[PDB]
Amino acid sequence: QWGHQEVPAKFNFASDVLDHWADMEKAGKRPPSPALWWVNGKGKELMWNFRELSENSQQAANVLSGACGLQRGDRVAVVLPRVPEWWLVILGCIRAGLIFMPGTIQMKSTDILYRLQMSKAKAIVAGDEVIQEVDTVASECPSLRIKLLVSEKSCDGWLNFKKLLNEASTTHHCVETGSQEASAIYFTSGTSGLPKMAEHSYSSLGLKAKMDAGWTGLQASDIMWTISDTGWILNILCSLMEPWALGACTFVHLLPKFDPLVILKTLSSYPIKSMMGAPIVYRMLLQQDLSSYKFPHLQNCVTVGESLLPETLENWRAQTGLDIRESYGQTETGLTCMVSKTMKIKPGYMGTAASCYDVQIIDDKGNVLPPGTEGDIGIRVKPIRPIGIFSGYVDNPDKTAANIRGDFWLLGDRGIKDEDGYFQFMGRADDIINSSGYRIGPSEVENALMEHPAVVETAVISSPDPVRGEVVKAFVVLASQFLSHDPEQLTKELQQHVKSVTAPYKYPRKIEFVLNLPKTVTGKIQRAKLRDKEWK
Ligand SMILES: Nc1ncnc2c1ncn2[C@@H]1O[C@H](COP(=O)(O)OP(=O)(O)OP(=O)(O)O)[C@@H](O)[C@H]1O
Ligand SMILES: [Cl-]
Ligand SMILES: [Cl-]
């Protein structure tokens, strides 16, 4: 339905990338080099060089294939905190030809159930903080056969990973996995609807990562700290595959409370040269006392996930002397556009295409648009599907086919490309409002509302109108002190306020006051959920 690939028949990140570095150490061609440095922020630290990482990951593969009896192709849910065993287990899965399916420890039992059922997981790997949740729902998951516990303690019904690991052989015969063979399944965030199962192959993660490696400016002798939930695709790409493609060290902090002061102390206390985090990390750091906590070793700061505001960029540069280089992507496509270390930074832009990709702005018929014209961001997938693109939605070929327009995979995001090929994000396409022939981006309206002291949080969406077709509607969470005000009067005041700072065709003709907004587990506002209910 979407091009053929040009790839080697076989590919495996463990054998083709990681084991190279272990072999160099074994052969005396490189000194023993740190690969994984883990700290808990309470005095415990652990470090593996590449040889040790290879050996201990071979033990993990033996545990999974031997003791757990998991066979090539079997699906393994992984729900762990930021502990070194996540890295070991994922590598174990890659070696043993098992499909790893990471998720967040922040899941409720209902979330865990949905994913285990939908995914037909045959195994779950978890820590002691989620086993009680798992054990309330496990009987309802008929494919689930193995429960593997990473803990200092044992629990009846759960296999003891750490004990089995120490018992296992340090030799494992890596499976000769195919480049297009399924390696992972990631659920999408659920921002627009129920989470989708996105299948990735050995090459779409590992070979793509190998091709991208170094875009951050990270080099072989350096340490990168990627700040991420272990359930996100960011973790596999930037915490695991990209440093290890280069022979560099990945730094992991348990960071049990995402505390920005702990982040700051960590930067200032360890020789971290490169860091990756969502824009909120930088925003939080800027609210800390950066006079008192210097980090002269830090060189490269990158971000992904939401728009990097120009003010954030400017403030960071002023306070630290450093740039923040933005990137863009989605579960389905991995790293799609970025500002590489040699590129000029353009505030408000997310960079240029990843090297495997032909990224364009396209019209409603799939035609490439000139620079300066807003349209849909797409990646060319015909006649050749590029390395890095996912394999499709599991059990949902129709949904896969629905996002292909002509020769392009649609990201679902609007954008504009400038004269140098840099992309500017212009919003989720489905969120743009069409009222009286005007297109209205909710972000500008939400920003105008957030200026007003009454507004704590807001979401702007379309609402159906006996006709203007649809109108702009704002859902507003009020500051406590405004709950007492007359709402009709306050509504007019907020309307007038927006009319004062934006094109007055953009103002919310409807305002509904609400006590909360629906969000994903990561805190992303579910505008679709609101739109769906608004439209019945
Ligand atoms: N640099 C960025 N600037 C603006 N938005 C970004 C950037 N990076 C990513 N995004 C947004 O995040 C999206 C990808 O997020 P992800 O794949 O986690 O799932 P999601 O789309 O939020 O959830 P779902 O697919 O279930 O609706 C992109 O399609 C885009 O809307
Ligand atoms: Cl913390
Ligand atoms: Cl920002």
Ligand SMILES: [Mg+2]
């Ligand atoms: Mg999405």
Ligand SMILES: [Mg+2]
């Ligand atoms: Mg406000």
